[PDB]
Design a binder for this molecule. Structure first.
Ligand SMILES: [Zn+2]
Length: 209
């Protein structure tokens, strides 16, 4: 029985681990490393809740300044076992959240894209739409769509906060109607992988009104 974590928590862990590796490689001052080892150790400690033997050992390995890439890959592979993947809704539910969209169907998904996903977004060309589904803080299924512009620009995604290939996403409020939004990753799978803080996603959702 492994304690359960969210995909974004996994992504955050992957994130701090790679950063730690970089600190081991490129930073000299010993005390800065100690503060960082301890912080990272705490961040992971804080996410999991309780240490089980695998987590204690992974941490022991992470805490070695001689940490290797192969070791990282083993640790990441193990942390993944703790993640509760995004749950795709049934077609009948998907259809009920997009009541006015006749002829809608989720595109095929990799379960392991799903282990890093906080939300699901896919683009439909004829419509110039990106559809997004997610579960809110109450775990209820929600869905929306918006216009995603053709132009790709190199910029920080409003959702994942990473410098990426982004496009302007605009949502029409209930209808004479209003249009709101901002730049987000054109490729939402990649977006989900970079998303380490789900509040940013929910904040993006709130700004769309
Ligand atoms: Zn993004």
């Amino acid at each position: 029985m492994k304690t359960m974590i969210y995909p974004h928590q996994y992504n955050y862990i992957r994130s701090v681990i790679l950063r730690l590796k970089n600190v081991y490689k490129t930073v000299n001052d010993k005390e800065t490393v100690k503060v960082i080892q301890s912080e990272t150790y705490n961040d992971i400690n804080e996410i999991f809740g309780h240490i089980d033997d695998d987590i204690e050992e992974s941490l022991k390995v992470l805490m070695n300044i001689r940490l290797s890439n192969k070791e990282i890959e083993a640790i990441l592979n193990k942390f993944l076992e703790y993640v509760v993947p995004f749950e795709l809704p049934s077609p009948q539910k998907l259809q009920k959240v997009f009541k006015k969209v006749k002829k809608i169907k989720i595109p095929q998904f990799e379960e392991y894209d799903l282990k890093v996903s906080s939300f699901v977004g896919w683009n439909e060309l004829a419509s110039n739409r990106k559809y997004i589904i997610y579960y809110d803080e109450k775990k209820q299924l929600k869905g929306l769509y918006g216009e995603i512009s053709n132009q790709v620009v190199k910029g920080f995604c409003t959702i994942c906060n990473k410098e990426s290939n982004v496009s302007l996403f605009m949502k029409k409020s209930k209808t004479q109607y209003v249009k709101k939004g901002d730049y987000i990753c054109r490729d939402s799978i990649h977006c989900n992988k970079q998303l380490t803080d789900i509040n940013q996603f929910y904040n993006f959702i709130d700004k769309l009104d």
